[PDB]
Tab-separated table of C-alpha atoms and ligand atoms in Angstrom:
chain	number	residue	atom	x	y	z
A	1	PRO	CA	0.271	-0.170	-0.138
A	2	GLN	CA	0.931	3.842	-0.453
A	3	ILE	CA	-0.070	5.734	2.779
A	4	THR	CA	-0.060	9.279	2.274
A	5	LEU	CA	0.553	11.822	5.111
A	6	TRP	CA	-2.077	13.771	5.299
A	7	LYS	CA	-3.215	12.684	8.847
A	8	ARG	CA	-1.462	10.531	11.239
A	9	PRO	CA	-0.542	6.475	9.632
A	10	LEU	CA	-2.171	4.087	11.511
A	11	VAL	CA	-2.940	0.971	11.963
A	12	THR	CA	-4.107	-1.642	12.582
A	13	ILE	CA	-1.840	-4.387	14.196
A	14	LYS	CA	-1.767	-7.681	16.592
A	15	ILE	CA	0.718	-8.665	19.052
A	16	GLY	CA	0.558	-10.846	21.162
A	17	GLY	CA	-3.040	-12.248	20.707
A	18	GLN	CA	-4.156	-8.419	20.974
A	19	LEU	CA	-5.388	-5.913	18.545
A	20	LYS	CA	-4.300	-2.886	19.362
A	21	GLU	CA	-3.534	0.642	16.642
A	22	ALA	CA	-0.051	1.675	16.302
A	23	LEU	CA	1.833	4.748	14.336
A	24	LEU	CA	4.166	3.873	11.830
A	25	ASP	CA	6.887	6.089	12.927
A	26	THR	CA	10.019	6.353	11.222
A	27	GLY	CA	11.162	8.770	13.754
A	28	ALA	CA	11.284	5.903	16.367
A	29	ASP	CA	14.621	2.828	16.130
A	30	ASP	CA	12.795	0.837	18.210
A	31	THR	CA	8.692	0.024	18.766
A	32	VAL	CA	6.818	0.126	21.572
A	33	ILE	CA	3.722	-0.711	22.633
A	34	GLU	CA	1.414	0.131	25.963
A	35	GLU	CA	1.420	-1.501	28.854
A	36	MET	CA	0.541	-5.332	28.036
A	37	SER	CA	1.782	-8.616	29.032
A	38	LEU	CA	4.888	-10.561	26.472
A	39	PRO	CA	6.811	-13.779	26.211
A	40	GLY	CA	10.080	-14.655	27.441
A	41	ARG	CA	12.805	-12.532	29.904
A	42	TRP	CA	12.970	-9.116	29.684
A	43	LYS	CA	15.643	-6.512	30.251
A	44	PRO	CA	14.771	-2.685	31.761
A	45	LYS	CA	15.506	0.512	28.660
A	46	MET	CA	15.275	4.186	29.270
A	47	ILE	CA	14.265	5.402	25.749
A	48	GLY	CA	14.480	8.951	25.144
A	49	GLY	CA	12.954	11.401	22.856
A	50	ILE	CA	11.038	15.150	22.891
A	51	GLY	CA	10.287	15.743	26.357
A	52	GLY	CA	13.320	13.079	27.571
A	53	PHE	CA	13.094	9.984	28.579
A	54	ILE	CA	10.546	6.730	29.621
A	55	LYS	CA	11.278	3.499	31.496
A	56	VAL	CA	10.342	0.287	29.566
A	57	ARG	CA	10.623	-3.513	29.044
A	58	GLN	CA	12.274	-4.697	26.087
A	59	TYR	CA	10.661	-8.528	25.223
A	60	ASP	CA	13.085	-9.598	21.888
A	61	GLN	CA	11.838	-12.171	19.095
A	62	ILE	CA	8.454	-10.814	19.028
A	63	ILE	CA	6.427	-11.731	16.921
A	64	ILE	CA	4.176	-9.639	15.289
A	65	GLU	CA	1.402	-8.801	12.155
A	66	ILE	CA	1.463	-4.676	11.238
A	67	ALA	CA	-1.020	-4.456	8.925
A	68	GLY	CA	-1.808	-7.505	7.880
A	69	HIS	CA	2.244	-7.921	7.480
A	70	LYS	CA	3.947	-10.343	9.835
A	71	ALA	CA	7.425	-8.834	11.343
A	72	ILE	CA	9.605	-10.137	14.106
A	73	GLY	CA	11.938	-8.251	16.103
A	74	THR	CA	12.061	-6.362	19.850
A	75	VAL	CA	9.321	-4.574	22.147
A	76	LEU	CA	9.535	-2.501	24.110
A	77	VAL	CA	6.204	-2.099	26.200
A	78	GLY	CA	6.200	0.641	28.869
A	79	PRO	CA	4.222	4.204	29.445
A	80	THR	CA	4.202	5.480	26.140
A	81	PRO	CA	1.700	8.070	25.053
A	82	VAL	CA	1.076	6.230	21.512
A	83	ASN	CA	1.347	2.882	20.441
A	84	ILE	CA	5.217	3.447	17.850
A	85	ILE	CA	6.228	0.383	15.072
A	86	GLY	CA	9.840	1.888	15.141
A	87	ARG	CA	12.565	1.371	11.782
A	88	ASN	CA	13.079	-2.634	13.669
A	89	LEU	CA	10.048	-3.900	12.590
A	90	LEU	CA	8.978	-1.418	9.347
A	91	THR	CA	12.060	-2.295	7.703
A	92	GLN	CA	11.147	-6.142	7.836
A	93	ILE	CA	7.057	-5.521	6.140
A	94	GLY	CA	9.545	-3.755	2.689
A	95	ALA	CA	8.725	0.136	4.695
A	96	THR	CA	9.796	3.150	2.633
A	97	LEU	CA	9.274	6.729	2.890
A	98	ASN	CA	9.239	8.505	-0.636
A	99	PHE	CA	9.621	11.513	-2.494
B	1	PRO	CA	14.128	8.999	-3.411
B	2	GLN	CA	12.860	5.638	-2.254
B	3	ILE	CA	14.591	6.180	1.552
B	4	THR	CA	14.940	3.067	3.530
B	5	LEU	CA	14.689	2.882	7.035
B	6	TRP	CA	17.993	0.361	7.831
B	7	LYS	CA	19.352	3.819	9.200
B	8	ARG	CA	17.830	6.506	10.607
B	9	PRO	CA	16.348	9.086	7.576
B	10	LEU	CA	18.324	11.528	8.295
B	11	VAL	CA	18.687	14.133	5.110
B	12	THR	CA	20.554	17.727	4.880
B	13	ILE	CA	17.764	20.540	4.628
B	14	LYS	CA	18.369	24.214	4.424
B	15	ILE	CA	16.335	27.074	6.593
B	16	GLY	CA	17.962	31.080	6.835
B	17	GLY	CA	20.789	29.921	4.717
B	18	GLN	CA	22.331	27.376	6.237
B	19	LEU	CA	22.534	23.622	5.840
B	20	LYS	CA	21.409	21.325	9.161
B	21	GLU	CA	20.621	17.859	9.099
B	22	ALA	CA	17.190	16.965	10.023
B	23	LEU	CA	14.689	13.591	10.458
B	24	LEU	CA	12.210	12.443	8.495
B	25	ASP	CA	10.168	11.865	11.332
B	26	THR	CA	6.526	10.447	10.125
B	27	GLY	CA	5.311	10.334	13.803
B	28	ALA	CA	5.799	14.182	14.049
B	29	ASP	CA	2.660	16.070	13.028
B	30	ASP	CA	5.304	19.585	13.258
B	31	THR	CA	8.384	19.956	12.315
B	32	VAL	CA	10.590	21.170	15.070
B	33	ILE	CA	14.170	22.507	14.923
B	34	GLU	CA	16.881	23.316	17.523
B	35	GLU	CA	17.318	26.385	18.336
B	36	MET	CA	18.780	29.324	15.387
B	37	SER	CA	17.297	32.588	15.056
B	38	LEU	CA	13.589	33.198	12.805
B	39	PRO	CA	12.333	36.365	11.034
B	40	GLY	CA	9.020	37.289	12.443
B	41	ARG	CA	6.906	36.794	14.871
B	42	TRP	CA	6.231	33.411	16.851
B	43	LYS	CA	3.106	32.263	18.985
B	44	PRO	CA	3.499	29.686	21.708
B	45	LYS	CA	2.976	25.783	21.494
B	46	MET	CA	3.027	23.362	23.680
B	47	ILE	CA	3.736	19.367	22.091
B	48	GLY	CA	4.174	15.918	23.872
B	49	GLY	CA	6.874	13.490	22.779
B	50	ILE	CA	7.710	9.976	24.238
B	51	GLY	CA	9.749	11.797	27.599
B	52	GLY	CA	6.560	13.902	28.010
B	53	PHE	CA	5.712	18.092	26.427
B	54	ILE	CA	7.821	20.846	25.826
B	55	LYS	CA	7.248	24.321	25.072
B	56	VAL	CA	8.313	25.682	21.664
B	57	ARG	CA	8.017	28.842	19.226
B	58	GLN	CA	5.846	28.526	16.931
B	59	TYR	CA	7.294	30.583	13.167
B	60	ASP	CA	4.783	30.064	10.188
B	61	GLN	CA	5.479	30.942	6.663
B	62	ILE	CA	9.339	29.989	7.246
B	63	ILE	CA	11.003	29.132	3.915
B	64	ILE	CA	13.192	25.711	4.023
B	65	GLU	CA	14.568	22.955	1.548
B	66	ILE	CA	13.916	19.474	2.875
B	67	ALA	CA	16.397	17.658	0.302
B	68	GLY	CA	16.269	20.198	-2.255
B	69	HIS	CA	12.916	19.981	-1.817
B	70	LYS	CA	11.422	23.483	-2.058
B	71	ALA	CA	8.442	24.252	1.170
B	72	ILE	CA	7.353	27.071	3.041
B	73	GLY	CA	5.385	26.356	6.655
B	74	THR	CA	5.582	26.471	9.840
B	75	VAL	CA	8.458	25.595	11.932
B	76	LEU	CA	8.638	25.099	15.593
B	77	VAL	CA	12.054	26.031	17.438
B	78	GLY	CA	12.341	24.224	21.122
B	79	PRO	CA	14.358	21.718	23.074
B	80	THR	CA	14.282	18.726	20.469
B	81	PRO	CA	17.217	16.117	20.405
B	82	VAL	CA	16.832	15.925	16.790
B	83	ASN	CA	16.116	18.273	13.818
B	84	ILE	CA	12.775	16.641	13.296
B	85	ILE	CA	10.466	17.298	10.060
B	86	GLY	CA	7.005	16.052	10.592
B	87	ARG	CA	3.700	16.059	8.468
B	88	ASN	CA	3.167	19.648	8.041
B	89	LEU	CA	6.490	19.563	5.288
B	90	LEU	CA	6.202	16.322	4.873
B	91	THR	CA	2.974	16.454	2.924
B	92	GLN	CA	5.085	19.452	0.979
B	93	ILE	CA	7.579	17.389	-0.241
B	94	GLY	CA	5.133	14.579	-1.330
B	95	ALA	CA	6.476	11.749	1.126
B	96	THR	CA	4.207	8.403	1.283
B	97	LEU	CA	5.074	5.665	3.542
B	98	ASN	CA	5.018	2.642	1.366
B	99	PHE	CA	4.920	-1.504	1.576
C	1	B0F	C1	3.130	13.691	18.028
C	1	B0F	C2	3.083	15.823	17.824
C	1	B0F	C3	2.099	16.363	18.089
C	1	B0F	C4	2.914	17.151	17.358
C	1	B0F	N1	1.884	18.663	17.433
C	1	B0F	C5	0.453	18.656	17.812
C	1	B0F	O1	-0.098	17.986	19.293
C	1	B0F	C6	-1.105	19.690	17.485
C	1	B0F	C7	-2.633	19.151	18.180
C	1	B0F	C8	-3.718	19.094	16.846
C	1	B0F	C9	-4.467	17.691	16.828
C	1	B0F	C10	-4.662	17.981	15.034
C	1	B0F	S1	-5.921	17.898	14.751
C	1	B0F	C11	-6.823	16.750	14.305
C	1	B0F	C12	-6.147	15.918	13.966
C	1	B0F	N2	-5.841	14.177	14.875
C	1	B0F	C13	-5.022	14.421	16.262
C	1	B0F	O2	-5.429	13.979	16.435
C	1	B0F	N3	-3.573	15.823	15.817
C	1	B0F	C14	-3.733	15.925	15.083
C	1	B0F	C15	3.723	18.257	17.133
C	1	B0F	C16	4.707	17.352	17.205
C	1	B0F	C17	5.716	17.939	16.296
C	1	B0F	C18	4.540	16.179	17.718
C	1	B0F	O3	5.555	14.941	17.489
C	1	B0F	C19	6.777	15.250	19.043
C	1	B0F	C20	7.149	13.696	19.138
C	1	B0F	O4	7.775	13.730	20.049
C	1	B0F	N4	6.757	12.573	18.016
C	1	B0F	C21	7.807	11.618	18.196
C	1	B0F	C22	6.776	9.863	18.230
C	1	B0F	C23	5.070	10.634	19.429
C	1	B0F	C24	4.144	10.951	19.169
C	1	B0F	C25	3.439	11.205	20.144
C	1	B0F	C26	3.800	10.702	21.213
C	1	B0F	C27	5.315	10.268	21.497
C	1	B0F	C28	5.971	10.184	20.372
C	1	B0F	C29	8.472	11.222	16.613
C	1	B0F	O5	7.955	10.745	15.437
C	1	B0F	C30	9.769	10.889	17.142
C	1	B0F	O6	10.207	9.230	17.033
C	1	B0F	N5	10.485	11.129	17.426
C	1	B0F	C31	10.589	12.776	18.248
C	1	B0F	S2	12.421	12.863	18.922
C	1	B0F	C32	12.554	11.730	17.379
C	1	B0F	C33	13.269	11.993	16.494
C	1	B0F	C34	14.017	11.396	18.841
C	1	B0F	C35	11.348	10.178	18.080
C	1	B0F	C36	12.115	9.478	19.295
C	1	B0F	O7	11.168	9.487	20.026
C	1	B0F	N6	12.571	8.536	19.376
C	1	B0F	C37	13.238	7.695	20.106
C	1	B0F	C38	11.527	5.958	20.521
C	1	B0F	C39	9.921	5.998	20.316
C	1	B0F	C40	9.475	5.047	20.663
C	1	B0F	C41	9.942	3.822	20.865
C	1	B0F	C42	11.959	4.293	20.755
C	1	B0F	C43	12.568	5.433	21.328
C	1	B0F	C44	13.921	5.675	20.752
C	1	B0F	C45	14.248	6.688	19.873
C	1	B0F	O8	14.471	6.880	18.797
C	2	CL	CL1	18.693	2.783	5.350
């Protein structure tokens, strides 16, 4: 698909058996989702941007479906204001910026 | 161009006759640049990022080139960690997400 940028580029994702809405964010290195359970070990991490830093849990090897496209990678979980699909998963679904 | 997301989507911009590096950020509604001098009057705005909110100065109708593409629009100035080109200007340069 081709997604224009007149509006926020929100899509439906499936993660951990749950449907969520998430923002396709080329400015985010990583992927961060609001509080939810995920399988496996985790380690704490600080992520930063506008407004400063938040503490998240880093889970690895998390299978995800983004607008119908499956991708595996690290997913961060914590008090993000918005669910965010970052570059680590955008690459895997073949997403590019074009102009 | 087609910009892949294996690396950060950094480009060169020109604003006030000066070249700067900036991030093409589909998660940003607006465009925010690190402290610099812009002409004219400004208006207040507060915007929220991953860590919380920052106060910025809003300048309108600013001439700005993004990866060689000419735009004229709103530029916000404040304590962002990265010069961010957001959707207000990504739309002016005809950028889309594609997969
Ligand atoms: C989000 C935002 C809003 C405004 N304007 C407004 O809010 C004005 C309100 C008007 C509302 C209009 S009107 C009708 C429509 N409907 C609606 O709901 N809105 C519209 C202005 C700016 C500049 C905005 O972006 C701020 C921002 O920081 N956005 C970031 C994403 C985000 C969105 C919302 C909450 C929190 C974060 C950005 O895309 C990013 O990734 N950034 C900006 S700074 C940065 C380049 C470092 C990077 C970053 O944080 N990255 C970090 C990141 C993020 C996630 C996971 C890991 C990490 C590590 C690091 O890479
Ligand atoms: Cl790349």
